[PDB]
Predict the 3D structure of the following.
Amino acid sequence: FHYAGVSAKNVTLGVPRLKELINISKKPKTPSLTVFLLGQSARDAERA
Amino acid sequence: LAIKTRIISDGLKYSLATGNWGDQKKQARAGVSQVLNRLTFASTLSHLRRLNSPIGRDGKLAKPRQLHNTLWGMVCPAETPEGHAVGLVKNLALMAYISVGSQPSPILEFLEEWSMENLEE
Amino acid sequence: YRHLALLCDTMTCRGHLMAITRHGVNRQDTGPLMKCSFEETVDVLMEA
DNA sequence: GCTCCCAGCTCCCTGCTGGCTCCGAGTGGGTTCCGCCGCTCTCAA
DNA sequence: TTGAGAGCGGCCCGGAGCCAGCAGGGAGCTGGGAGC
RNA sequence: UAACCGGAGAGGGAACCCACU
C-alpha cells in the first residue's frame, strides 16, 4: 500500500488486514462501510 | 581481613567477562561486552566502533529502529545488521566523536563573574 | 476459490465465527491432543 | 379500621468497567557456567 | 600445648476472556388511606 | 606319544551473543 493524496478511507489492506481476517477482532483497526443509495438521491450530488 | 580482593576483583572480572550487567545474579542487560571479530582490520574497526540501542528487539515497534533524520555525520546510513535486529545496532561514522563530559562549576563561575543572576535573588 | 471457500466454510461451519485463537480452538472439542499441539499445552491437557 | 391498590422501601439481578495470563518463523559457532560458610583436629614453630 | 590448615558437615508490547464492583428495573413487605 | 582360543561405542547440559538463510 503506497497510499494516495486522498484519504481513500485508509484501506490498509495487507498483512495486518489478513491477520484480523484470520482472527476476527471485535475492534478492527479500520472498520469501513460501503454505502449504496437507491436512485436519484445518489444521482444528485446535492442529495448525496 | 575486612577487605576482600575476591569480592572486588572476581566480581568485576565476572561482570566484564560475562557481559550480563549484574553482580552475580541480578534480570540484567546482556550483550554489553562481546568478543572482538578478529577476521579483518575493517571488521575489527566496525566491531570497535559499534553502537547499540537497547530498545526491544524481536518486536513490531517500527519507529525506534527506523532511520531518523538526526544522523548526518554521526552514523553512516548504509551499515546495518541484516537479521532479526535491523536498525538497533549502528556503527560510528568518521567525524563523529562522543563528548567526554566536564564539570560545570567553572562555567557557573564564569556566569556569576559575569552578569547572569541566580533565580533565588 | 476452492481453497478460499473451504477456509471460510470451515471457519463458519460451527454455527458461529471462529477466530484462529486459543480462545476459540480450546472451546471447540476437537481433540485434547490437538489442543495440546496448539500453543497452549499444559492447561488444555490438564483440563481434559 | 381492615383489606388492598398503591407508595416507599428493599433486597434482587442483570447489566457495565478494571487487573491479568499468553502468545509472538529456520541452523552453526563461540564463550561462560556450575558454593559458601562453618568448624574441628594436625602438624609446625 | 597451641595455631592455622585440610576436609567433613551444614545452609517491549498485542489481545481477550474474566472476575469483581457498581447501577438501574422489580416484585415482595407493610404502611397509607380509600372504600365498605 | 599331546592339540586349532580375541577382544569397538561414544558421554554432559544450560544460557547468552554473533553470523548466515
Q: What stands out?
A: The CA atoms of residues 2 and 111 of chain B lie 47 Å apart. The first strand of chain B starts at residue 50 and ends at 52.
